[PDB]
Design a protein around this nucleic acid. Structure first.
Ligand code: MMC
Ligand code: MMC
Ligand code: MMC
Ligand code: MMC
Ligand code: MMC
Ligand SMILES: [Mg+2]
Ligand SMILES: [Mg+2]
Ligand SMILES: [Mg+2]
Ligand SMILES: [Mg+2]
Ligand SMILES: [Mg+2]
Ligand SMILES: [Mg+2]
Ligand SMILES: [Mg+2]
Ligand SMILES: [Mg+2]
Ligand SMILES: [Mg+2]
Ligand SMILES: [Mg+2]
Length: 133
RNA sequence: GCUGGGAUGUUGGCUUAGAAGCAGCCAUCAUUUAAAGAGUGCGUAACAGCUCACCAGC
């Protein structure tokens, strides 16, 4: 069982994909087209998928919501997180934005309340030099 | 002491060919918890895997 974060509508490259699971038994081509199939509904974003390979080299994979750090980057309109979180703020997002992301990632979050969800997201923002306003 | 658990965002941000708790720098929050560090050491190219913290039962 392998896991990785592949961009929406794109796959097959050797450096990014290939070698990775391609060395566990997986047949790249089938995944590239397959992944890029459903990753059509949500394109442009980087989404993490969990590939599972059965003894017979066959496989399946679940597509999850994009990473918090990623959504956060997007929200703050930045490209990278601070090189020194807290010491240097490189961006910021509104409390409502935290709410949006928390809502977006909810299926993958284990919070029992939207409040707890936002607290989770804020923890990530605090780790990448992104402030909340 | 023994057994079982040791979870979720998440491979935290940066860096890097990679850097996924564990080269290095910064941060070290939040969730679900009985409990579980943004992780004690081993380990991998990076993962994996083993181990410790911590909790539970005996
Ligand atoms: Hg690929
Ligand atoms: Hg492809
Ligand atoms: Hg990775
Ligand atoms: Hg730490
Ligand atoms: Hg692997
Ligand atoms: Mg509201
Ligand atoms: Mg004891
Ligand atoms: Mg044990
Ligand atoms: Mg990382
Ligand atoms: Mg690290
Ligand atoms: Mg590392
Ligand atoms: Mg390491
Ligand atoms: Mg706690
Ligand atoms: Mg329980
Ligand atoms: Mg005990």
């Amino acid at each position: 069982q392998i896991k990785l974060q592949l961009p929406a509508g794109k796959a097959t490259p050797a450096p990014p994909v290939g070698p990775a699971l391609g060395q566990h038994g997986v047949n790249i081509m089938e995944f590239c087209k397959r992944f890029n199939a459903e990753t059509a509904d949500k394109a442009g974003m980087i989404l993490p998928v969990v590939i599972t390979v059965y003894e017979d080299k066959s496989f399946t994979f679940i597509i999850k919501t994009p990473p918090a750090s990623f959504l956060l980057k997007k929200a703050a309109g930045i490209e990278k997180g601070s090189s020194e979180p807290k010491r240097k703020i490189v961006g910021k997002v509104t409390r409502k934005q935290i709410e949006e992301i928390a809502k977006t990632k909810m299926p993958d979050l284990n919070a029992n309340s939207l409040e707890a969800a936002m607290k989770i997201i804020e923890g990530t923002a605090k780790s990448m030099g992104i402030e909340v306003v």
